[PDB]
Design a protein around this ligand. Structure first.
Ligand SMILES: *CCC(=O)N1CC(NC(=O)COc2ccc(Br)cc2C(=O)N2CC=C(c3ccccc3)C2)C1
Ligand SMILES: Nc1nc2c(ncn2[C@@H]2O[C@H](COP(=O)(O)OP(=O)(O)O)[C@@H](O)[C@H]2O)c(=O)[nH]1
Ligand SMILES: [Ca+2]
Ligand SMILES: [Ca+2]
Ligand SMILES: [Ca+2]
Length: 166
């Protein structure tokens, strides 16, 4: 079985860093903000293997029929913010609504990902993230692409969410 995962979130939250840690097991500090490529990876989850197709999104702050098309094939979404960036946590709501639009559906598999948990200076409290995730009916996973903490879990959890949805 194959699963199409899409990684979304505001500029600079760690979309590309998270994805490259999962795929290539290293942390990148300066990854081109315009590159929007897909990656492949077979993984074993709860005894069952899947081929993961992960679409790293980028682009400009704008509507794009082209991007809508690449994202409509997504079966699950990683909603990423950075714990030291309040604006990125506020954008989460807008990302979820855009997903609902492109998929014409309220119950798309999704996980909320609070990235950069290695950093000391957090502006977004765990409790606000937990309540937001609670209201959406989705899991919330803290991660650090730098240390690799939570990275497998973020993606593995999204796959479980997709599996349950069928
Ligand atoms: C630095 C490059 C980068 O990482 N960026 C730019 C920003 N790009 C987007 O968010 C692209 O637009 C979307 C991405 C993913 C989805 Br799902 C939907 C959309 C989209 O069409 N819109 C229009 C309104 C948007 C918005 C987002 C946040 C706050 C307010 C409005 C997203 C990430
Ligand atoms: N401390 C820390 N820095 C990160 C983490 N993830 C990404 N970064 C850095 O934050 C910046 C944004 O990363 P990037 O993945 O390019 O953001 P994107 O625009 O969402 O793809 C880069 O300089 C990364 O090296 C993390 O988990 N912890
Ligand atoms: Ca990127
Ligand atoms: Ca344009
Ligand atoms: Ca409808």
């Amino acid at each position: 079985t194959e699963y199409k995962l899409v990684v979304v979130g505001a500029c600079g939250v760690g979309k590309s860093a998270l994805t490259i840690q999962l795929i290539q097991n290293h942390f990148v500090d300066e990854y081109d903000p315009t590159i929007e490529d897909s990656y492949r990876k077979q993984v074993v989850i709860d005894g069952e293997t899947s081929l993961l197709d992960i679409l790293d999104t980028a682009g400009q702050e704008e509507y794009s029929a082209m991007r809508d098309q690449y994202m409509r094939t997504g079966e699950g979404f990683l909603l990423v913010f950075a714990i030291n960036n309040t604006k990125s946590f506020e954008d989460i709501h807008h990302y979820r609504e855009q997903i609902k639009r492109v998929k014409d559906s309220e119950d798309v598999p999704m996980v909320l990902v609070g990235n950069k948990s290695d950093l000391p200076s957090r502006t977004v409290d765990t409790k606000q993230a937990q309540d937001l995730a609670r209201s959406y009916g989705i899991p919330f996973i803290e991660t650090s692409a730098k240390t690799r903490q939570g990275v497998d879990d973020a993606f593995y959890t999204l796959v479980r969410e997709i599996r349950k949805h069928k």
